[PDB]
């Protein structure tokens, strides 16, 4: 789903040859790892039993990791393009 | 700060495995801790660290209490 169905493709319009900006980006890495909990907020983050979890109330959820191509082409007036491109790092 | 700390170990299904297998090799009472002062030593040979030292640094899920048998699995 990630991947293949959440492509973005869209035009916004607001250096006054400018009429345009293309926002293009799509996912290419998607992992769902195990539940996990921060134990003293500075920790490096630990895993989550079940019963943990019902006790305390805290939600059974394992972090998605996303990372994505992003594609910032501007389009403006009598044609003229530029293409701005980053690689963005896995985040969660 | 150690309170937090205490409470959320305290709930950990891990503490408790860790402080039963402790107890069946006999480093720690088969008591409760009664007193805070008893709570200090379970929580010191169960985990591994004061919680002092745990809160100091970042490596945590090691030191626990390893059984004090090494059992032949064989």
């Known amino acids: 789903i990630v991947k293949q169905m959440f492509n973005v493709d869209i035009t916004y319009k607001d250096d006054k040859l400018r009429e345009s900006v293309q926002i293009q980006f799509n996912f290419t890495d998607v992992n769902i790892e195990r539940p996990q909990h921060r134990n003293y907020s500075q920790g490096n983050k630990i895993n989550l039993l079940p019963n943990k979890a019902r006790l305390c109330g805290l939600s059974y959820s394992g972090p998605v990791n996303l990372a994505a191509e992003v594609i910032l082409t501007a389009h403006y007036s009598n044609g003229r393009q530029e293409v701005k491109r980053a690689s963005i790092p896995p985040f969660q | ?74």
């Open chain 2, 1 to 74: 700060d150690t309170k937090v700390l205490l409470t959320e170990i305290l709930l950990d299904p891990m503490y408790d495995y860790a402080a039963t297998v402790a107890r069946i090799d006999g480093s720690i009472p088969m008591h409760k801790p009664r007193t805070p002062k008893e709570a200090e030593y379970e929580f010191k040979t169960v985990i591994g660290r004061t919680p002092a030292e745990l809160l100091s640094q970042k490596e945590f899920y090691d030191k626990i209490y390893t059984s004090k048998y090494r059992p032949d699995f064989t």
